[PDB]
Design a protein around this ligand. Sequence first.
Ligand SMILES: NC(=O)C1=CN([C@@H]2O[C@H](COP(=O)(O)OP(=O)(O)OC[C@H]3O[C@@H](n4cnc5c(N)ncnc54)[C@H](OP(=O)(O)O)[C@@H]3O)[C@@H](O)[C@H]2O)C=CC1
Ligand SMILES: Cc1sc2nc(N)[nH]c(=O)c2c1Sc1ccc(C(=O)N[C@@H](CCC(=O)O)C(=O)O)cc1
Length: 186
Amino acid sequence: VGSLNCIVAVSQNMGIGKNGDLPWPPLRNEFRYFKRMTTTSSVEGKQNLVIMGKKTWFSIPEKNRPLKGRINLVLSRELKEPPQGAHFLSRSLDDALKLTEQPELANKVDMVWIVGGSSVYKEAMNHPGHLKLFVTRIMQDFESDTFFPEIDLEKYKLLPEYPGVLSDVQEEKGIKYKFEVYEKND
Ligand SMILES: NC(=O)C1=CN([C@@H]2O[C@H](COP(=O)(O)OP(=O)(O)OC[C@H]3O[C@@H](n4cnc5c(N)ncnc54)[C@H](OP(=O)(O)O)[C@@H]3O)[C@@H](O)[C@H]2O)C=CC1
Ligand SMILES: Cc1sc2nc(N)[nH]c(=O)c2c1Sc1ccc(C(=O)N[C@@H](CCC(=O)O)C(=O)O)cc1
């Protein structure tokens, strides 16, 4: 299995969700960036694995589930089996990441992308080891009811370049945003 990564888009007030959807209106190219990053595998004959909480799964329009071209894993302790359309169910992050080591997935999975929500991001981010954060900074405040956890910049270095990530300010629907990549290893 290759690298471990989180990806998120977050407002200035650290918002990531409101009433089961995003705080901001649809940003088509920002969603396209999510799809390109999470789907693109560095490695022949492998796909990437996306790990998400149960509310995040059901927050994705059903027409777009499972996230195509990626192995979809949902985190839930209440569910008894993967939701309709999902591929795997795990009861904890550690369990998910261990599954990736099992014979079924061991040689199938390239990158692992944690795609939220808040609890899974916080655990991933505080877990020892080599981890990148792909963070889209939505450059306005938006009313939110779900927030991104604190990034500790003592450990997460903002990278001054990354191949394939545009460095200039984007704008869609009158909303400016910019892409960032953080890396720790502890
Ligand atoms: N802007 C962005 O990048 C992102 C936005 N969002 C937004 O965030 C909201 C959804 O996020 P959030 O409310 O945090 O919810 P989650 O997606 O984290 O779902 C929470 C549920 O997932 C299960 N769960 C979470 N973590 C684990 C774990 N480690 N192990 C086992 N089960 C776990 C639970 O289900 P159970 O009770 O069944 O055990 C828990 O009730 C929506 O508004 C969505 O649009 C989501 C991701 C990214
Ligand atoms: C769960 C996360 S992590 C994340 N990270 C960044 N940068 N931006 C986001 O908006 C999200 C979200 S919320 C989200 C909701 C729906 C979708 C979605 O429908 N994606 C489809 C469609 C992408 C497209 O519209 O092209 C896919 O990836 O195949 C993706 C992310």
